Structure 1
């Protein structure tokens, strides 16, 4: 499951830390940024403890300095079964939902209910089905010889089981699972009989299994609101869910928690590029962070002393000071030559690219000259240029050809400022003619 080709943060499998929350120099695909990784590990221990709620953490720094990488590492080290809602800042300006309603849905998607239940199933291999039918179809009789690798039995079947076996046609040689209470019969496949293919089950026929369900609060909010069904969880037209059913869900969840029938898991809400939110969003967040059913909100931004959207003044990080009072700030730093070389080596091993040493030094030099992402993007173009001339190892001139073909930001600005008469300026004046 979970198909994926290659991502920009696909080499990161978690925060590289020891048992004392100390960062290794290189572990789980993350190098450098020791203090930020330690602080994110402390935040991970906050999430794993779960005894506190509504704490806001801001990750701020220069662009292309391990912010989204840190968020991806926290999400990978959280594991499965714990909600993680990663949204962008421009995703809440909707046309059918208000900004506060979309923010409320994104807040309530990150708190889960854990419910354990038990059900009994008959998973077996069908030896023989015998069906006795009448002329008019009044009374049906049925014998079912079914087995595992451990037992063997014969069952008399009633009329509704005859109807449920005729529908979704079960033949001899099949492996099926039957639910007695609901009457759901699933064909797992065919057994190992050459005369798809699965293994015949072992042990008892009538098994009792415990399944664990994690249901978000937003799902129960959609279900309890009678105006729309559960298909609004998939189609997306929930449409301004009222606060009365939210109050009923908030009371019933605590009622289940006191009786021990369910458990509370908190999650992480990540807001990438938080500076694009409006002032009314920040004013809503300032009061939504103080609820008992509030997750931990991590926000990432790279702006420095910019204009707050919806106002006319300037604020640090694009955020007003009342929101910044309610947050603790993790600050990232720029990378050195050695860490850039290590990151580029990790990305070379990730994309199955074989690199010479001098090509790696050239990539590190042009990475500390221009950008990390530019050298991270040249490394796969140079492999195709290498494969055009039929050799596996990327050499120095293979990097030089890709450097010549594909430009960066500074060279493009230089060439545009040199030949600005051929481009459209702000005033809309261009020159298309060559002569005169």
Structure 2
């Protein structure tokens, strides 16, 4: 019923609502207004899909809450799967097991995919009989269209003796390695037998990132990325030769790289040492086209008393493109609230919509989006069906906001 993923803060966003010529619609695919910044997002998405001019940075500026993250989520959705879209917060680089610069270059590598094609042959049928003559034997597999015998060699007999697989089990046998996998006991876990041919060649493609390759080629069974046991790979010894070997895979017909996308949220958390590394990491061939956002203006840079836009030094500020987002009006706010209500199961009245739009233009946009569900549930408390203005007023009274909670501080608390 309820999956691990539920209705979050960016579920309505299904992608960029652009036309064939990168012209944003008034409201489409869950994106309201934001024409200029949305079309700029479209341009960057197109030049990413192109994947020729690498090493480009963009900064989505604007007032707090002006869909700066919505644009990034829409770009991610439009880019679709099969293309790495790495999203991390500016605070995630501050790690104790690895240095901030190492974490940053690690995220960079994670934001670059490598496309490799395989031509393995996979078997898929059901076991009829398994034999063992203490050693050699025979194996009879069955599918809905045919049955056949198989000579159980050393590897096969050993693997099938180690595994508990027996007669009457739909299984798969990768003739390359011999990995046995049972998808269900029998006819009705139980599951029916497969159809078509028993042994058939299957093409497999893996979009492994340079990070995965490095972790695979660093230690004995070095695939410890699952828990990031590694504190940092050996730069220029196991990290530069992997690049040369990937270039060898390319321009030969072995593999092709897939330019990913990086989205560092709240970049103002990055210190001066992280910005210094970006000034040179974005000048290499294998560098993704990253985007970033910051709600602060000319604030202090973490590390010194210097004041600079976005809290980012000038040396990096003159190295990226800024994308400012304008404030929303009544129309845009109301349409965003309506799309948010459509995402959920709530259905507000027209007067309720106007009241919520006024409340969201008074204090802030996110406050109305939050009060949506509160009023929806308060309506269900009085045994109603539609969220009326009275419910929104009751909620506005119950739940306070930033600006109204700050003004209520006429009683001194701790400090």
Shorter-normalised TM range: over 0.9
Gapped regions of structure 1 (runs ≥ 5): 426-436
Given that residues 299 and 307 in structure 2 are in contact (C-alpha distance below 8 angstroms), is that contact kept between their aligned partners in structure 1?
yes
The reply on whether 1:242 has 2:234 as its aligned counterpart is yes
Matched residue, 2:31: 30
The reply on whether 1:304 has 2:300 as its aligned counterpart is no
1:2 and 1:272 map into 2 onto residues whose CA distance is 26
Matched residue, 2:110: 109
1:356 and 1:218 map into 2 onto residues whose CA distance is 51
2:273 and 2:290 map into 1 onto residues whose CA distance is 17
Matched residue, 1:434: none
1:98 and 1:333 map into 2 onto residues whose CA distance is 36
Matched residue, 2:72: 71
Q: CA deviation at 1:152?
A: 2.3
Given that residues 130 and 166 in structure 2 are in contact (C-alpha distance below 8 angstroms), is that contact kept between their aligned partners in structure 1?
no
Q: 1:141 aligns with which of 137, 153, 157?
A: 137
Structure 1 residues 160 and 291: CA distance shift in structure 2, 3 A: closer
- How large is the Cα RMSD of the aligned pairs? 1.8
SS at match of 2:148: strand
Q: 2:319 aligns with which of 317, 326, 341?
A: 326
Q: CA deviation at 1:192?
A: 3.0
1:316 and 1:163 map into 2 onto residues whose CA distance is 65
**CA deviation string 1:68-127 (max 9, x = no partner):** 00000000001111111111111111112112111111111111111001111221123x
Matched residue, 2:147: 152
Given that residues 141 and 159 in structure 1 are in contact (C-alpha distance below 8 angstroms), is that contact kept between their aligned partners in structure 2?
no
Pairs within 5 Å for 1:3-402: 3-126=4-127, 128-129=128-129, 131=131, 133=133, 138-142=134-138, 144-158=139-153, 160-192=155-187, 196-226=189-219, 229-231=222-224, 233-243=225-235, 244-402=237-395
Given that residues 86 and 262 in structure 2 are in contact (C-alpha distance below 8 angstroms), is that contact kept between their aligned partners in structure 1?
yes
1:408 and 1:103 map into 2 onto residues whose CA distance is 36
Structure 1 residues 2 and 103: CA distance shift in structure 2, 3 A: farther
User: Where do 4+ consecutive residues of structure 1 move more than 4 Å?
Assistant: none
SS at match of 1:245: coil
1:382 and 1:360 map into 2 onto residues whose CA distance is 12
Matched residue, 1:430: none
Gapped regions of structure 2 (runs ≥ 5): none
TM-score, L = length of structure 1: 0.90
1:8 and 1:384 map into 2 onto residues whose CA distance is 18
- Which one is further off, 196-205 or 312-321? 196-205
Given that residues 120 and 176 in structure 2 are in contact (C-alpha distance below 8 angstroms), is that contact kept between their aligned partners in structure 1?
no
- Aligned residue-pair number: 413
1:273 and 1:132 map into 2 onto residues whose CA distance is 63
Q: CA deviation at 1:349?
A: 1.3
SS at match of 2:59: strand
**Greater C-alpha Rg:** 1
TM-score, L = length of structure 2: 0.95
Given that residues 106 and 211 in structure 2 are in contact (C-alpha distance below 8 angstroms), is that contact kept between their aligned partners in structure 1?
yes
SS at match of 1:258: coil
